[PDB]
Amino acid sequence: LGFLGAAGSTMGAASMTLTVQARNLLSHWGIKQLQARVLAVEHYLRDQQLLGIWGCSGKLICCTNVPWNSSWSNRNLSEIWDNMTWLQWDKEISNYTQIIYGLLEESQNQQEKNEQDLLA
Amino acid sequence: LGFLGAAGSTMGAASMTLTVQARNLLSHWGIKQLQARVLAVEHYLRDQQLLGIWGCSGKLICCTNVPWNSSWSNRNLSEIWDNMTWLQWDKEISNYTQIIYGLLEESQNQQEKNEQDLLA
Amino acid sequence: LGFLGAAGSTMGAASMTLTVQARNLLSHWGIKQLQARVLAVEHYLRDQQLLGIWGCSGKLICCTNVPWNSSWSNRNLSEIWDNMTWLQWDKEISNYTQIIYGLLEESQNQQEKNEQDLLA
Amino acid sequence: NLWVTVYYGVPVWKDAETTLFCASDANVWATHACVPTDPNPQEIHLENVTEEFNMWKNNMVEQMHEDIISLWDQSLKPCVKLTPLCVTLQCTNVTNNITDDMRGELKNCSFNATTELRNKRQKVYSLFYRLDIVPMVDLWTNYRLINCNTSAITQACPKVSFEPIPIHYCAPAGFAILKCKDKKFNGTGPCPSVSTVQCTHGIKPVVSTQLLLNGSLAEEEVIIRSENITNNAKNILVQLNTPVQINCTRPNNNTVKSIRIGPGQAFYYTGDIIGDIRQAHCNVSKATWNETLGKVVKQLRKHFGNNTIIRFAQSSGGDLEVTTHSFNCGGEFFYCNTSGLFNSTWISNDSITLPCRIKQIINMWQRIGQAMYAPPIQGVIRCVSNITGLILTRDTTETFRPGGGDMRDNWRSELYKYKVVKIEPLGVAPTRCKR
Amino acid sequence: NTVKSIRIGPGQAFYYTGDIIGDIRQAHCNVSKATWNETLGKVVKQLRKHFGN
């Protein structure tokens, strides 16, 4: 039930502990300690900025409008979620990541402009 | 009308100056000053992370789905919001605060999973 | 197409590169390196806090309920948004900025209270 | 059709090299600098996690090395500089009842020291160990201190102990330390049982050479860990599963006197010896030691031929700092001869006494530009330590000799079970769910 | 230049010129003459745009 306790568990189970890990991201001699504190903050902020860009701000589980091109992983939703741990999944699809992130950004840009045009 | 000006006023009045206080949370000789700046940031981020966890991101007034078990405070609205100042309230229900925060976290997790299965 | 590439283009074009600039806002001898990193964070957080105050958290484009008093600028929608760059616009309405920010803050406070009453 | 869903707070990590900070539990040494620890912080079992560990490529070792050396140097900054004492010393033999083993080991020297006033000098008569002085320019009785032809000597402050107070290493937020709990783990490769901790256990920063003192013991059996076992250029770290007790003494009742050499600057020196003059020494139980080596041999035979011969021998060379067992015993620095421990061949209440030398002017780290003078200690010194591991090097018949000159090996013997990783909470997966 | 050194203190070395091998001559720098004259001519042409022509 503690931090990373679910690391060896299946994705379909581990997804229920997202708040456990989220809360462990924040908190001359003494300078290296300041450097460590500053980078912990900078890494945190980059993840939050990215969620903001994608339109996932404020939530731990974010559904999007980008579809899963099978060429990323042609495995099925009883294998990805019941037979694989997040560590194994991350390795499987680590190559095709800066494609997915790019697509998520593009999708959100279109959603913002379409939403302004409706509110008119 | 300035920072903490409403501290001695009733909760029902003080609730209208939330932006006044929110704006005062952000901004070897010289090191202790740098340390102070870093910790001010860390405290700010922890409050924001917590609001995000509860589903209150981006807002000063957040209604939730958790009910008020009378055992925490059995006073009526027209006591809490007309007489007591936030300082007196904070003392009254200081003990039972980690319990409330835990309930808010669980409530939001249930809500995020229910929504995922309504967008299916 | 890179950082500030759109600076010389018209507002109506530049508005499509908002993510390009947003992504470039984050990241004794050597102490100044920490000071620089800390201030970059502080400036970032102030912008985010302000968007939160106005109810624009999580978005790069945010429509509001505040109307454009002609006194700020009486230029018509196709002298601003396809004849004028963002640099020239900022100069045009520099004096009248803090007014707008104050109005946006008031608008959001009215919006948060009204919503709360409707969820009773 | 499956659509991309973004998850934040995902229990994923990657190998990482970051800055660790120190912490401690609750006469100042290796403290103030570290943050007080949390009681019983946390340990999370991570039941189904298998992970790869690789000691020797572990940067936690380099950080511990840097912190110890830096804190060591910091502690000498406010102490008295013994540069006014770089003079001609006139030295003669010691007029006491000296055993044969100590002949020539001590000298009674007379020097002119500076005083509180700039225009005055005094005449001081002190005992020195032979190892701290050098004769010069063909003059029979004229000596100088060993390190006045290189670095300035700094006297260690008399109020500062060198007690090896344990230091804990803690991860910054966003990072975690993984701990290998496999009792058979040899320092590398997959570890089937890996838990997560906040901060490592405290490790005592004990500084020694060929015999590791007061460390952790192996849980079940002697473990031999090496970067490449067939490469004779590598050191072999052998962890014992049982301690061997070693009793060390400096059996001479010393009188320590002090003088001012400057404006509030005190110098400490051995004035005189009460009673007989004897050699410092260490006692190792003979039977325990022979059992210990037999176990080591049985394990060596799993990497070397089985129907083989294993030989133990004394170091073939190098200076006193590496050919002996160096350690701090009650504030004094001992250099003990271990040839009595490693003189046997193993083929397919008695005790061993190790004679010891004492030095007051030491270098600690393998550096050229620093020296330090350890004030002598009043009375008689005794200490008892646990031998928890050996550092061996290798030349049919495989011959092994004591090594350990490189201090990072001592720290590897405690940090081998820890790994630093970075948490990567953001990721994606397909789910049947679209905005 | 033949360089010698002495110790002046505990690990403190001082370096100095011991002596000179060969003749003693003055240090100097060479600037090509025509190149320098062309360089100034260009500078002068530009100065004349701020000063009288």
Ligand SMILES: *[C@@H]1O[C@H](CO)[C@@H](O[C@@H]2O[C@H](CO)[C@@H](O[C@@H]3O[C@H](CO)[C@@H](O)[C@H](O[C@H]4O[C@H](CO)[C@@H](O)[C@H](O)[C@@H]4O)[C@@H]3O)[C@H](O)[C@H]2NC(C)=O)[C@H](O)[C@H]1NC(C)=O
């Ligand atoms: C391996 O671990 C053992 C066990 O911890 C360790 O032995 C210990 O060494 C210390 C330091 O020499 C001993 O502490 C002293 O004990 C005597 C008892 O007579 C006291 O008088 C001493 O106090 C005086 O000196 C202090 C110097 O710092 C002053 O601060 C103080 O005010 C007094 O003037 C001091 O308490 C300790 O007793 C032993 N422990 C045992 C069980 O013998 C050994 O040194 C470690 N080995 C290595 C290599 O680190």
Ligand SMILES: *[C@@H]1O[C@H](CO)[C@@H](O[C@@H]2O[C@H](CO)[C@@H](O[C@@H]3O[C@H](CO)[C@@H](O)[C@H](O)[C@@H]3O)[C@H](O)[C@H]2NC(C)=O)[C@H](O)[C@H]1NC(C)=O
């Ligand atoms: C090393 O040399 C020094 C200097 O010679 C020796 O110290 C001296 O030792 C003698 C004999 O113990 C001392 O004489 C005694 O003086 C006291 C009064 O101080 C007196 O009560 C005794 O009856 C005796 O006369 C002498 O004072 C002392 N000098 C100093 C500076 O302390 C030292 O003992 C020698 N060490 C050895 C063992 O070689």
Ligand SMILES: *[C@@H]1O[C@H](CO[C@@H]2O[C@@H](C)[C@@H](O)[C@@H](O)[C@@H]2O)[C@@H](O[C@@H]2O[C@H](CO)[C@@H](O)[C@H](O)[C@H]2NC(C)=O)[C@H](O)[C@H]1NC(C)=O
């Ligand atoms: C789905 O992917 C296929 C194959 O794309 C390749 O693998 C991807 C992971 C990525 O690395 C692509 O850049 C690779 O080309 C796509 O088919 C190709 O698409 C690209 C444009 O992205 C095009 O230039 C190629 O000609 C196409 N042909 C192949 C087989 O290489 C397919 O278009 C992708 N579908 C989606 C939803 O974008």
Ligand SMILES: *[C@@H]1O[C@H](CO[C@@H]2O[C@@H](C)[C@@H](O)[C@@H](O)[C@@H]2O)[C@@H](O[C@@H]2O[C@H](CO)[C@@H](O)[C@H](O)[C@H]2NC(C)=O)[C@H](O)[C@H]1NC(C)=O
């Ligand atoms: C409402 O609270 C009661 C009792 O409240 C407990 O003590 C209060 C002062 C405060 O600390 C509360 O948070 C505590 O829960 C609950 O009744 C008990 O509930 C606990 C589990 O929470 C259970 O173990 C006990 O057996 C229950 N019985 C007692 C001693 O009253 C009640 O369940 C709470 N109801 C709601 C709606 O949450």
Ligand SMILES: *[C@@H]1O[C@H](CO[C@@H]2O[C@@H](C)[C@@H](O)[C@@H](O)[C@@H]2O)[C@@H](O[C@@H]2O[C@H](CO)[C@@H](O)[C@H](O)[C@H]2NC(C)=O)[C@H](O)[C@H]1NC(C)=O
């Ligand atoms: C729209 O602006 C006019 C002009 O206001 C001036 O310029 C503004 C940018 C700001 O700086 C004002 O403070 C300036 O007075 C406003 O007309 C005047 O508003 C002020 C303040 O309300 C009032 O005292 C004057 O009597 C007004 N004069 C007139 C000619 O009516 C007007 O109120 C603004 N409207 C809105 C939507 O706020």
Ligand SMILES: *[C@@H]1O[C@H](CO)[C@@H](O[C@@H]2O[C@H](CO)[C@@H](O)[C@H](O)[C@H]2NC(C)=O)[C@H](O)[C@H]1NC(C)=O
């Ligand atoms: C280390 O071992 C030696 C040898 O056993 C010990 O020396 C004996 O000490 C007792 C007590 O003072 C004497 O009665 C014996 O005569 C000594 N033996 C010899 C051969 O001289 C020594 O005490 C032990 N000590 C340590 C490490 O302090």
Ligand SMILES: *[C@@H]1O[C@H](CO)[C@@H](O[C@@H]2O[C@H](CO)[C@@H](O)[C@H](O)[C@H]2NC(C)=O)[C@H](O)[C@H]1NC(C)=O
């Ligand atoms: C430890 O003591 C032994 C003696 O038992 C020393 O070994 C001798 O070393 C000399 C060279 O200096 C050789 O000529 C002798 O043949 C060696 N003797 C034996 C029995 O092998 C050893 O050098 C000492 N080591 C240290 C570090 O002091």
Ligand SMILES: *[C@@H]1O[C@H](CO[C@@H]2O[C@@H](C)[C@@H](O)[C@@H](O)[C@@H]2O)[C@@H](O)[C@H](O)[C@H]1NC(C)=O
């Ligand atoms: C998911 O896949 C299961 C196994 O299918 C077979 O083995 C995998 C590794 C692939 O090679 C696949 O093409 C093979 O057919 C099935 O038993 C299960 O029913 C599948 N579920 C869904 C929803 O498709």
Ligand SMILES: *[C@@H]1O[C@H](CO[C@@H]2O[C@@H](C)[C@@H](O)[C@@H](O)[C@@H]2O)[C@@H](O)[C@H](O)[C@H]1NC(C)=O
């Ligand atoms: C609110 O309560 C005031 C005090 O009366 C009582 O004590 C508090 C703690 C509550 O338990 C309440 O239910 C009790 O009646 C009353 O004087 C006042 O009339 C009450 N007002 C309302 C709107 O109920």
Ligand SMILES: *[C@@H]1O[C@H](CO[C@@H]2O[C@@H](C)[C@@H](O)[C@@H](O)[C@@H]2O)[C@@H](O)[C@H](O)[C@H]1NC(C)=O
């Ligand atoms: C917009 O107006 C143009 C003329 O601009 C006039 O002066 C500027 C400074 C503003 O005060 C503006 O409101 C004035 O009308 C016209 O040339 C142009 O055609 C107009 N365009 C549209 C879309 O009506």
Ligand SMILES: *[C@@H]1O[C@H](CO)[C@@H](O)[C@H](O)[C@H]1NC(C)=O
């Ligand atoms: C570990 O795997 C076993 C199946 O081999 C499973 O029953 C168990 O629940 C898993 N443990 C965790 C923590 O997921």
Ligand SMILES: *[C@@H]1O[C@H](CO)[C@@H](O)[C@H](O)[C@H]1NC(C)=O
């Ligand atoms: C995946 O399913 C197979 C079925 O044979 C099982 O043996 C394996 O342990 C499962 N792995 C996990 C991580 O649950």
Ligand SMILES: *[C@@H]1O[C@H](CO)[C@@H](O)[C@H](O)[C@H]1NC(C)=O
């Ligand atoms: C990613 O690319 C590397 C290229 O060296 C390759 O070795 C690895 O197997 C790839 N992983 C996949 C297929 O995602």
Ligand SMILES: *[C@@H]1O[C@H](CO)[C@@H](O)[C@H](O)[C@H]1NC(C)=O
């Ligand atoms: C302070 O209390 C008085 C009543 O005694 C009230 O009239 C006044 O408005 C209150 N002031 C504030 C800041 O709440």
Ligand SMILES: *[C@@H]1O[C@H](CO)[C@@H](O)[C@H](O)[C@H]1NC(C)=O
């Ligand atoms: C508020 O306080 C006043 C003075 O104690 C009291 O008269 C009044 O009834 C209180 N109002 C309520 C119901 O909270």
Ligand SMILES: *[C@@H]1O[C@H](CO)[C@@H](O)[C@H](O)[C@H]1NC(C)=O
């Ligand atoms: C809060 O806890 C303290 C310590 O147990 C206790 O003295 C106090 O009465 C409690 N207050 C409340 C509001 O129950």
